[PDB]
Amino acid sequence: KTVVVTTILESPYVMMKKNHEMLEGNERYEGYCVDLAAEIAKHCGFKYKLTIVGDGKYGARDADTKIWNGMVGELVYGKADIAIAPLTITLVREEVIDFSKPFMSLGISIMIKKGTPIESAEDLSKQTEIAYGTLDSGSTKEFFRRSKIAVFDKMWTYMRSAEPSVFVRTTAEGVARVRKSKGKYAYLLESTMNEYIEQRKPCDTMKVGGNLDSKGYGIATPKGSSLGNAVNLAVLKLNEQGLLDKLKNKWWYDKGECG
Amino acid sequence: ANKTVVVTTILESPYVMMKKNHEMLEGNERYEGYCVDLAAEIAKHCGFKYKLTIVGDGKYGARDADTKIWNGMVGELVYGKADIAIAPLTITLVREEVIDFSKPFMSLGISIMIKKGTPIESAEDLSKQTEIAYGTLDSGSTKEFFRRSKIAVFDKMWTYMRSAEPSVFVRTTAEGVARVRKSKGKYAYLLESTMNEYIEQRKPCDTMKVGGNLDSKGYGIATPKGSSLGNAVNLAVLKLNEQGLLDKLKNKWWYDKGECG
Ligand SMILES: N[C@@H](Cn1oc(=O)[nH]c1=O)C(=O)O
Ligand SMILES: N[C@@H](Cn1oc(=O)[nH]c1=O)C(=O)O
Incomplete structure (x- = not known):
C-alpha cells in the first residue's frame, strides 16, 4: 500500500x-x-x-x-x-x-527588520511602539499562551489583545509583515525558519537574542x-x-x- | 503492586x-x-x-x-x-x-577540549598533525562515532586513535580532563559539548572548548x-x-x- x-x-x-x-x-x-x-x-x-x-x-x-x-x-x-x-x-x-x-x-527566536531597536524578548515586552506576533495554530503561539514566565506571560497578554491582529496565517506572511512594517513589527518564529530567511534577499531581516527554548x-x-x-x-x-x-x-x- | x-x-x-x-x-x-x-x-x-x-x-x-x-x-x-x-x-x-x-x-554534540594555548581549533586541525595526541572515553557513543564514521576526517582520526601508543582512550571523563591538564598541550580530548562546557567553568580554568560540534544528538x-x-x-x-x-x-x-x- x-x-x-x-x-x-x-x-x-x-x-x-x-x-x-x-x-x-x-x-x-x-x-x-x-x-x-x-x-x-x-x-x-x-x-x-x-x-x-x-x-x-x-x-x-x-x-x-x-x-x-x-x-x-x-x-x-x-x-x-x-x-x-x-x-x-x-x-x-x-x-x-x-x-x-x-x-x-x-527554539523560538526573534526576527526583526535590520536596525530595529530590539535585542531580546524582554525588550519587546517593555515597549509598545514595536508590535509583535506569531503564527496561528502552531507550537509557538501555544508557548506564550501556556507560559508562566513573567516576560513571556506579559508578551502573551499583549498579543492576544493587540489591534490589529498580530497573528499571521503563514510564516511567509509574518516575514512579509516584518519587511513592510518599517521596523514597527517583530515576528516570533522558530530559529530554523529565521536563520533561513536571514540568508535570503533582500537580506533585510535578522535574528536577535538567544532562543527562548530548546526542542x-x-x-x-x-x-x-x-x-x-x-x-x-x-x-x-x-x-x-x-x-x-x-x-x-x-x-x-x-x-x-x-x- | x-x-x-x-x-x-x-x-x-x-x-x-x-x-x-x-x-x-x-x-x-x-x-x-x-x-x-x-x-x-x-x-x-x-x-x-x-x-x-x-x-x-x-x-x-x-x-x-x-x-x-x-x-x-x-x-x-x-x-x-x-x-x-x-x-x-x-x-x-x-x-x-x-x-x-x-x-x-x-x-x-561531540567536541574538542584543549589546554589553553593549544594550537588547535578544529577536528581537521587534529587530523593533520601528530604532535598533539587525542582520544576519547571508552565504552561510549563518542568512541563508537569515530569507529563507525565514513566521513574522511573522522575516519582518519579513528585510524590514528585506535592504534596510538600509549593508549589515547580513558575510562572516565575525569581521567581525560587530567590528561589534558597535565600534558603541556600535547593531548587534546574528544568529549560531549555538555561535559566540555561544564569543565570549562571549573578551576583552574585551564581548558577550553574549540570549534563547532561534530554532530547533534x-x-x-x-x-x-x-x-x-x-x-x-x-x-x-x-x-x-x-x-x-x-x-x-x-x-x-x-x-x-x-x-x-
Ligand atoms: N513547527 C511549528 C509551526 N510554527 O513555525 C514557527 O516558526 N512557529 C510555529 O508555531 C509547529 O510544529 O507547530
Ligand atoms: N554520553 C556518552 C558517554 N560519553 O561521554 C562523552 O563525553 N563521550 C562519551 O562517549 C554515552 O552515552 O555513551
Missing part, C-alpha cells in the same frame, strides 16, 4: 519546484523534507505520496469543538499515515500522535502505528550517517544569497 | 556527584547533581519511589563484539538489573535497538524494551522542558556556580 505523507508548504522544507505546473505527483515538490521523505521511505521500504495539508496549518486543538486541525488532525482522523515536516514535538501532540526522535533542533522536529505517525518503529530507527541512522547535516547545509547555507 | 524503582546512573559531574558529607548520608541523600534533581522530578511526575544506584562497572554502555554482551548502564537495563536509567546517556541507533529512550532532555531517559514506565517518563520529560525546568536545572549545575568568572 502507498503511504500517504502529509506535509506543509514551508520554505525550505517543502517548496513548489519551478515549472511545477507541468509536473505531477511527488516531482512537483523540492526541499529538506522532500529529500528526507525519500530517505525515510528508502530505509523503511515503502512507496509514498506527498500531499500538502488541506487547511495549511501545523496542528492545534480547538478549545471548543476539541477537534484537531492541520497535519496533526490529518493523522488523528486517518487522513494521512505519516507526517514529514517541521512539526514540533510537544506534550499535547505527543498525547494523541507518536513522534520519532527529533531530526532537527530549534525539535519529529516525524509523526498515528498513535500506535506500525510504521513508528522503523521510522524512528531510520531518523537515528540518517543522523548518525551525517545525512541530516548534509540536507541542512544544502537547503540553508548553500546558495547563500546574502551578505 | 507498586515497587521501588531501581535507577541506574553514573558518577559523572555535574549530573551525579557525591555530596560533601556523603558519609553521614545514606541512600539517595548521598548524591547531588542535574540528574539527581531530574530523577526527583520524573519520579514525582510519574508517581513512583526509587533507589539511585551507581552502575557497577562505571561505564555508559557498549556491546562487546564477539560475545555480544552489553556493559555499563545499557547492560543493567538489558539484563534486568535496573528498571530505568537517568543519566547523560546518548540516544543512539544500536542502543535504541535493545532499549527504549524518552525524547531528549538535553542536547549535545541528545540524552534520553532509558528503560528496558517494553517497560510500562516508558510512556509516562517520556511525557514527564516533555512537560519538564516546556515548563522551563530543564533550562533552569542546566544553569543551576553549569553556570550558577561556575568557578571561572
Whole structure:
C-alpha cells in the first residue's frame, strides 16, 4: 500500500519546484523534507505520496469543538499515515500522535527588520511602539499562551489583545509583515525558519537574542502505528550517517544569497 | 503492586556527584547533581519511589563484539538489573535497538577540549598533525562515532586513535580532563559539548572548548524494551522542558556556580 505523507508548504522544507505546473505527483515538490521523505521511505521500504495539508496549518486543538486541525488532525482522523515536516514535538501532540526522535533542533527566536531597536524578548515586552506576533495554530503561539514566565506571560497578554491582529496565517506572511512594517513589527518564529530567511534577499531581516527554548522536529505517525518503529530507527541512522547535516547545509547555507 | 524503582546512573559531574558529607548520608541523600534533581522530578511526575544506584562497572554502555554482551548502564537495563536509567546517556541507533529512550532532555554534540594555548581549533586541525595526541572515553557513543564514521576526517582520526601508543582512550571523563591538564598541550580530548562546557567553568580554568560540534544528538531517559514506565517518563520529560525546568536545572549545575568568572 502507498503511504500517504502529509506535509506543509514551508520554505525550505517543502517548496513548489519551478515549472511545477507541468509536473505531477511527488516531482512537483523540492526541499529538506522532500529529500528526507525519500530517505525515510528508502530505509523503511515503502512507496509514498506527498500531499500538502488541506487547511495549511501545523496542528492545534480547538478549545471548543476539541477537534484537531492541520497535519496533526490529518493523522488523528486517518487522513494521512505519516507526517514529514517541521512539526514540533510537544506534550499535547505527543498525547494523541507518536513522534520519532527529533531530526532537527530549534527554539523560538526573534526576527526583526535590520536596525530595529530590539535585542531580546524582554525588550519587546517593555515597549509598545514595536508590535509583535506569531503564527496561528502552531507550537509557538501555544508557548506564550501556556507560559508562566513573567516576560513571556506579559508578551502573551499583549498579543492576544493587540489591534490589529498580530497573528499571521503563514510564516511567509509574518516575514512579509516584518519587511513592510518599517521596523514597527517583530515576528516570533522558530530559529530554523529565521536563520533561513536571514540568508535570503533582500537580506533585510535578522535574528536577535538567544532562543527562548530548546526542542525539535519529529516525524509523526498515528498513535500506535506500525510504521513508528522503523521510522524512528531510520531518523537515528540518517543522523548518525551525517545525512541530516548534509540536507541542512544544502537547503540553508548553500546558495547563500546574502551578505 | 507498586515497587521501588531501581535507577541506574553514573558518577559523572555535574549530573551525579557525591555530596560533601556523603558519609553521614545514606541512600539517595548521598548524591547531588542535574540528574539527581531530574530523577526527583520524573519520579514525582510519574508517581513512583526509587533507589539511585551507581552502575557497577562505571561505564555508559557498549556491546562487546564477539560475545555480544552489553556493559555499563545499557547492560543493567538489558539484563534486568535496573528498571530505568537517568543519566547523560546518548540516544543512539544500536542502543535504541535493545532499549527504549524518552525524547531528549538535553542536547549535545561531540567536541574538542584543549589546554589553553593549544594550537588547535578544529577536528581537521587534529587530523593533520601528530604532535598533539587525542582520544576519547571508552565504552561510549563518542568512541563508537569515530569507529563507525565514513566521513574522511573522522575516519582518519579513528585510524590514528585506535592504534596510538600509549593508549589515547580513558575510562572516565575525569581521567581525560587530567590528561589534558597535565600534558603541556600535547593531548587534546574528544568529549560531549555538555561535559566540555561544564569543565570549562571549573578551576583552574585551564581548558577550553574549540570549534563547532561534530554532530547533534541528545540524552534520553532509558528503560528496558517494553517497560510500562516508558510512556509516562517520556511525557514527564516533555512537560519538564516546556515548563522551563530543564533550562533552569542546566544553569543551576553549569553556570550558577561556575568557578571561572
Ligand atoms: N513547527 C511549528 C509551526 N510554527 O513555525 C514557527 O516558526 N512557529 C510555529 O508555531 C509547529 O510544529 O507547530
Ligand atoms: N554520553 C556518552 C558517554 N560519553 O561521554 C562523552 O563525553 N563521550 C562519551 O562517549 C554515552 O552515552 O555513551
